[PDB]
Amino acid sequence: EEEAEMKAVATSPSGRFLKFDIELGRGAFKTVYKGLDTETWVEVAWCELQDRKLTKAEQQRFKEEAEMLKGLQHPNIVRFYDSWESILKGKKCIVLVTELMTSGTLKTYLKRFKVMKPKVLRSWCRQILKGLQFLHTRTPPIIHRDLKCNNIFITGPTGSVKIGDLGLATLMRAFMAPEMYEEHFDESVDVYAFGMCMLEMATSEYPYSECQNAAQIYRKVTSGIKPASFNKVTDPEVKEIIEGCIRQNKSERLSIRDLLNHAFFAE
Amino acid sequence: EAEMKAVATSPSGRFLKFDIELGRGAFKTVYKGLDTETWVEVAWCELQDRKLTKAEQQRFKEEAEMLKGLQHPNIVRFYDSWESILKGKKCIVLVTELMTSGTLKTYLKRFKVMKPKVLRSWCRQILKGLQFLHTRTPPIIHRDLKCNNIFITGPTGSVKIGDLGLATLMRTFMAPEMYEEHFDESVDVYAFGMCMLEMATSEYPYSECQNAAQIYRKVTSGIKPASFNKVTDPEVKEIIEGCIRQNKSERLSIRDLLNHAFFAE
């Protein structure tokens, strides 16, 4: 495609991708930079993360994750290209390289468009569900463990959506027995997440806004009191789905296929 | 000689609170009391509010009913409990057998080193206690075994596991299942190993690690404390290892430990 100079500041160990000193955004211990895939000439995302004092066992796990993730290709999963261990500044960093998303998250979308029309929520939600089923039906099944409106990215205002922030779950993680530090998850935790997401999209309100501190929310949730937002849901068919998803007893919650086999989500 | 200079009474009337403080912990305070039935003195633990839900209150109530029932030598007796407002805040009151002769922690502090004959006898006893709790029905898991909650009758006496209810009472947007705590018997087998190790080396395990996190890495990575290596008796050393195996299914069971030679006669 035409011609190009490099004038890049760093490159992937594979030599495939180049980093520019053009910072795109600055989150937690993350900093995203603009970059290029020499192979496709397509603009890409160079995520400088930080040191999460990665034990080591987990390092292996991350690598094993990376492989899978790189292999993944779906119309609704922000493609993962590559990752590696680097010493930027003075601290042991992990760098990730992914499909660059340019049109902001649902959240940014919500902050801008203020409210969301039925058609949108219907389509974009379906799109998310599709993505999830894809991840869950991977072999072995991959659990997001962290779906939120701000890591659901949109292709265009008029476009489609895709699930992002792919590995960050593992990456960003008295005396008691080790098995006490064990976090046990399953697919259904993603359904729970999804419902919460749908609700926020539907009400343009963050669930449990009412709450004032962390410990307060704990009570409400563990006691299965729904967020004040829930009541503010207008369409009763939506309300159905939201409820079914956020059911406190995990074994009573809906499944992905069930949501997709729902009427609202029928084509 | 059956006086009633008190400040408070149990709902049942059985127990009376004296206005004399025996200790002041985190969000708790212990005062002296009286089982007017047996006429024996007792500990009256005014706790504090633990931002409790309510479902858990029910659970705790059920737990506590189980507790009132228990009788074993190597367990502090538990008498009564109920909800109360002191000052402006909801508190939970606990009544238990009064232990005045301190803990393993206060014992190591005073005597500096533990004699191996003692260790053999007392550790034997802690195992006996845990076996009793684990064979309750439902099984009772401590979750929070430590040396400053293993009490002794006296320097020439024996051991009783305490801080019984505090596992549940003190604890130890995301789906509720994420708040669930996943413990089993081994969690206590693990915590016992730490108890035994402290006793063997008169050092608090992982005394080394200044940062709390430094400990996380080691534990999660499967690294035994510095003090582990300082265990001079090989038979003791093996037991501690078998207890603090990071793989939960690899750790010994209570039965295993009791069946072992070290713990015998």
Residue numbers in the entry:
A (entry chain A): 130 to 302, 314 to 407
B (entry chain B): 132 to 303, 315 to 407
Question: Can you quote the paper on this entry?
Answer:
WNK1/E388 (WNK3/E314) is noteworthy because it is on the Activation Loop that undergoes large conformational changes upon phosphorylation. Mutation of E314 in the Activation Loop of WNK3 (WNK3/E314Q and WNK3/E314A, and the homologous WNK1/E388A) enhanced the rate of autophosphorylation, and reduced chloride sensitivity. The high activity of the mutants WNK3/E314Q, WNK3/E314A, and WNK1/E388A suggests a loss of the CWN1-stabilized inhibitory conformation. To address whether conformational changes induced by the mutations correlate with the effects of PEG400, WNK3/SA/E314A and the corresponding WNK1/SA/E388A were crystalized. WNK3/SA/E314A crystallized, affording limited diffraction to 3.4 Å. WNK3/SA/E314A crystals were in space group P1, and adopts a unique dimer in which the Activation Loops are swapped. The significance of this domain swapping is unclear. Excluding the Activation Loops, comparisons of uWNK3/SA/E314A, uWNK1/SA, and uWNK1/SA/PEG400 show that uWNK3/SA/E314A is more similar to uWNK1/SA/PEG400 than uWNK1/SA (with r.m.s.d.’s of 0.7 versus 0.85, respectively). Furthermore, the orientations of the 3/10 helix and helix C most resemble WNK1/SA/PEG400. Crystallography of WNK3/E314A shows that it exhibits conformational differences at the same loci as observed by PEG400 applied to crystals of WNK1.
